[PDB]
Amino acid sequence: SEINIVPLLDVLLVLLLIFMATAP
Amino acid sequence: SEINIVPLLDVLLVLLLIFMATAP
Amino acid sequence: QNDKLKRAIIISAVLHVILFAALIWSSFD
Amino acid sequence: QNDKLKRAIIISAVLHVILFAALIWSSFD
Amino acid sequence: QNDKLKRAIIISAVLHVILFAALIWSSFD
Amino acid sequence: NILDLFLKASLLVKLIMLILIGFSIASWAIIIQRTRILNAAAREAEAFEDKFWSGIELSRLYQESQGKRDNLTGSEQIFYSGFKEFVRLHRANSHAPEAVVEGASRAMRISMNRELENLETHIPFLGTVGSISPYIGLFGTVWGIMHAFIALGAVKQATLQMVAPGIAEALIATAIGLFAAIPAVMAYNRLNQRVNKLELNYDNFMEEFTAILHRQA
Amino acid sequence: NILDLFLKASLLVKLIMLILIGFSIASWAIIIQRTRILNAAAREAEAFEDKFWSGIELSRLYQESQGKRDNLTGSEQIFYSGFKEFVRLHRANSHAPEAVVEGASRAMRISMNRELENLETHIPFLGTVGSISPYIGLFGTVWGIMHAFIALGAVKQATLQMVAPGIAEALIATAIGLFAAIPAVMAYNRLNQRVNKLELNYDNFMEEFTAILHRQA
Amino acid sequence: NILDLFLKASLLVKLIMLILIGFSIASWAIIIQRTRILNAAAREAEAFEDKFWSGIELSRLYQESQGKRDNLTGSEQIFYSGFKEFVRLHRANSHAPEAVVEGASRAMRISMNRELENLETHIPFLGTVGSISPYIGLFGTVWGIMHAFIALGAVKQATLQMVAPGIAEALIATAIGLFAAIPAVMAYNRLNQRVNKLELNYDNFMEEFTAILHRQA
Amino acid sequence: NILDLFLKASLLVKLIMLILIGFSIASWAIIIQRTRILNAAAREAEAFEDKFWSGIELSRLYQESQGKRDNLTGSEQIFYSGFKEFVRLHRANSHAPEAVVEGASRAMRISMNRELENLETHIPFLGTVGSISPYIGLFGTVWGIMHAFIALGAVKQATLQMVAPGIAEALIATAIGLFAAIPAVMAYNRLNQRVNKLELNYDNFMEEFTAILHRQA
Amino acid sequence: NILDLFLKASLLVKLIMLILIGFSIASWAIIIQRTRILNAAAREAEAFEDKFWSGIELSRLYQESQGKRDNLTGSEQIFYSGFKEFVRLHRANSHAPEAVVEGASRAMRISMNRELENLETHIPFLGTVGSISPYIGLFGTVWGIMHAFIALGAVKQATLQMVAPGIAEALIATAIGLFAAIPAVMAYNRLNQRVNKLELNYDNFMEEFTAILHRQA
Numbered sequence A, B: 001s002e003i004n005i006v007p008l009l010d011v012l013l014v015l016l017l018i019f020m021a022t023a024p
Numbered sequence C, D, E: 001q002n003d004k005l006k007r008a009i010i011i012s013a014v015l016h017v018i019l020f021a022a023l024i025w026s027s028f029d
Numbered sequence F, G, H, I, J: 001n002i003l004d005l006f007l008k009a010s011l012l013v014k015l016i017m018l019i020l021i022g023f024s025i026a027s028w029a030i031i032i033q034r035t036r037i038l039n040a041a042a043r044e045a046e047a048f049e050d051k052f053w054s055g056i057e058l059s060r061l062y063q064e065s066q067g068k069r070d071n072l073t074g075s076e077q078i079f080y081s082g083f084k085e086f087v088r089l090h091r092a093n094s095h096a097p098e099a100v101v102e103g104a105s106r107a108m109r110i111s112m113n114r115e116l117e118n119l120e121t122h123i124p125f126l127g128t129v130g131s132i133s134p135y136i137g138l139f140g141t142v143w144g145i146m147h148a149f150i151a152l153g154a155v156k157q158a159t160l161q162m163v164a165p166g167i168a169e170a171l172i173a174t175a176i177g178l179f180a181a182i183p184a185v186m187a188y189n190r191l192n193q194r195v196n197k198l199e200l201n202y203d204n205f206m207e208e209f210t211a212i213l214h215r216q217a
Helices: A008-021 B006-021 C002-028 D002-028 E002-028 F002-008 F011-052 F058-067 F075-091 F097-119 F124-152 F160-170 F172-216 G002-008 G011-052 G058-065 G075-092 G097-119 G124-154 G164-216 H002-008 H011-052 H058-067 H075-091 H097-119 H123-152 H160-179 H182-216 I002-007 I011-052 I058-068 I075-091 I097-119 I124-152 I160-214 J002-008 J014-052 J058-068 J075-092 J097-119 J123-154 J164-170 J172-216
Strands: none
Touching: A008 B006, A008 F124, A008 F160, A008 G124, A008 G164, A008 I160, B006 H123, B006 H160, B006 I124, B006 J123, C002 F002, C002 F011, D002 H002, D002 H011, E002 I002, E002 I011, F002 F160, F002 F172, F011 F075, F011 F097, F011 F124, F011 F172, F058 F075, F075 F097, F075 F172, F097 F172, F097 G164, F124 F160, F124 F172, F124 G164, F160 F172, F160 H123, F172 H097, F172 H123, G002 G164, G011 G075, G011 G097, G011 G124, G011 G164, G058 G075, G075 G097, G075 G164, G097 G164, G097 I160, G124 G164, G124 I002, G124 I160, H002 H160, H011 H075, H011 H097, H011 H123, H011 H160, H011 H182, H058 H075, H075 H097, H075 H182, H097 H182, H123 H160, H123 H182, H160 J123, H182 J097, H182 J123, I002 I160, I011 I075, I011 I097, I011 I124, I011 I160, I058 I075, I075 I097, I075 I160, I097 I160, I097 J172, I124 I160, I124 J164, I124 J172, J014 J075, J014 J097, J014 J123, J014 J172, J058 J075, J075 J097, J075 J172, J097 J172, J123 J164, J123 J172, J164 J172
């Protein structure tokens, strides 16, 4: 009985791409 | 032998916070 | 133990309702 | 055992206070 | 024993080479 | 403005949030109820273990147990059923000793199985909550972000402030998921350990009592 | 539509989506198939366990068991194999009484192992699916994200209108992965618990039958 | 500086910080207090085992043990209980040797179980704290990210002050969560392997004592 | 595309990728090798276990084994060692049954230990690879991000589009690390489960053979 | 550059770096020290195993061991202690053969435990270092980034170009931690495996010598 938060990296990368895309 | 995921999540969160702080 | 289970359910429900209401009220402020 | 628990709690509290003071001092430098 | 290990090593190597070649090709598309 | 965010969210997000709240409410009460039962059972077993080996004759113990009728629970029920069937088979004519011993042993096994089944109720439900809770929240967050981008795509030219409120509303589900997930994971292991520790004592007591009665006949 | 997004996707994304859909279908089929068998086995075992202790002579039970020999299962099969080995060894050779009991015990153990192996089919695949699917989804998303970063590295003055379809396609893979991974985890533990609870009845019956065979040997 | 950010944060973040601080204090106290008890138990066990193999008559040791009966602990209590049960059984009704051997064995087992239960306390709490420590920090970081995104949604252009609180609260939550988890991880296995070696010494002593008692009767 | 990024990478990143690829190749080779050996050992053990209980005299089996006069594998080795020890130990030294039984059992234990050691090679390498692999990927990611940020400050123009490639390199490194890591982590447990069952079967066979030898003393 | 890094770094940043460097040096020194000791122990054990089976009478081996005097390690120490205890117990003529055999076995067990404890020194420090190292680096990185962000708000002339040198220096902390932690796990596993290998040889020799000594009684 543990906690799996593996899919959270997906959301982190998706959100990270937004800031880079709208940089200029 | 089990996969340790916490350090990767911490590094990703740190990078995301760094990118967010530079928005303004 | 069934009546004790119902009492525990009621106590948990009322405590959760009170805590959530307090958190929501403090969130606006 | 309970007295040992109280002594351990007191020691831990003193150590935590000292560590917090050291952290606050190091935050300025 | 050793010959079987060598054969398994060769099979793994060729499979990995094929997989990497397939992955590289998909990048141009 | 948490209430405003809850009202503004789509149907699926609200449904998932209600489901998670229901799981949390159902989860707390089970732990609160089961801890007391396990704690009481431990001391009752210790007390009965203390009383049995005092050197008192078995007939006196049976006479004491007769009055308490159905109030007997735990190892007391085991002793009552075992001695009852032992006496019933012994008073029958033309009896082999080993047959009577086995007849008592099967009753002891049945009683112990019933007691364990009664004790271990509702425990497996916590593991399902602890293992499924975060996934639903992540699914809700992904769905919310997907529809946020779908709504953003309607206008091809937009800035971050056009989509920023949508993302913040989506991340609500994962927090509630983790909040519901943590306590069940915390409590399940301790409950299982207590159950196993209690079962071992009953096994040992049954073995010793079966061994003792063999020399009686 | 989703079909349009599937069509415009490259080979890798299509393959990943097809694999995930296949895993979902296989998991549902396995759960549905295994539930009925695990339900029927317990009923048959309980019925035979109730029938056995009626006090009928073992020879009559063995004679009746030969009528439907090709369709026996569970405790009936265990008892049939044990009795057959016992009678063959006793009436075909002259040895010490302990050797016959040892051979009967070995035959019963082998039969029980075969029965458990037949009962425990196709279970670990659910656990493998549950432990594998999220990583496949993450890889499928990371591929697209890396390609989007490579594309954005060369272009200038991005308006967030060119990379939106990439995010829209990437999110669906993770959503499908989570949906596939949800039910296998909850099915696995329940099925394992049922099998573990079923093993003890066979163990107890083997011990009791060996003890019974010892006396009449 | 840190106090400014802590005060500026909402109440939920402060509650999470307080919970983490409490867990850290409790873990430190338990780790401090367990080692002295373990070392004292080991030294006492070795010291008592030294005197048992010196050729002194067992009757003299039993007489000496009575003088401090109420304060007996460690390996000394097992011998006391075993010898008391053996002498009581032998002095009464002239029981068979197997009966007195089994009585000594059961008394020794009960005493050993009680002693091991006394030794192992609060150890699983450290493991639970070490396992579940960082996820509360992740909860806090998620809430901080949500607050930062909500702040970024203002109509006006964002500034440093508008996004200052969320970043600070998330960083503080992560830092405290990481800080609270080190000692439990560093101490759990070292504390468990300490008891795992005393159990073996107790088992060996029990076997030797039973073997010695076998010849006397 | 990606090949250009790999060509433009630094030395340490390329070395890390090569090391990870080599580890993956070695792990896959070992995994492919071990399974056939395990299955062959299982079937060979089952065949000889079946051959033992057919009823043929043990002397004939020993004569056939000696006539083979070659290295054996599985349960055949244990029987040969035990019988060879028994043949000399029965006539020589003490004729008490306990001494001969213990002497045969010691040889059986030694043979079991050496066979188990010979069957369990190259397994811990998979575990150590699974434990160590992700940290190298994280090291590569951190190094890439550090160099990307260091290079940015050397120019007057500050654009994130200039920083974009380093993130892609870091993500590639992390993905390769996880891909190398996972399969060994699964295979370690998947392989240990089989060795446990083989050990149990060997122990049961040893117990049966020891009883059979003892009953004729 | 190290002096520049230390000058530019504040408190709680250089202390962590010094601790990590010390841990790396200590781990390397411990590994280098222990490899030779283990190799020499293995060679000496093999040599004495070769010597024992030469057919020389036990008495002559005893004078050879006495000629060696104080300098004895492992099997030599076990044999010397066992023979000394056996002779001392036998000369008294006040104990049964089983008593003297048990007394002889106890001394050998104690000597074996002491030798294993002497061999197994300093191993757990490697495990502690490997388990702890990354988290200290993460804590240092978080603290450094917090300080860098805090110092930025003081100057209102901030630019995205001027923060890159400050951000770059913070991440050096975690790389050192990972580099320190990498070899510790592999060294720990290999050393533990070698110790486990030696334990079996010691146990086998102890059992064989106990049987041989009991034979002459």
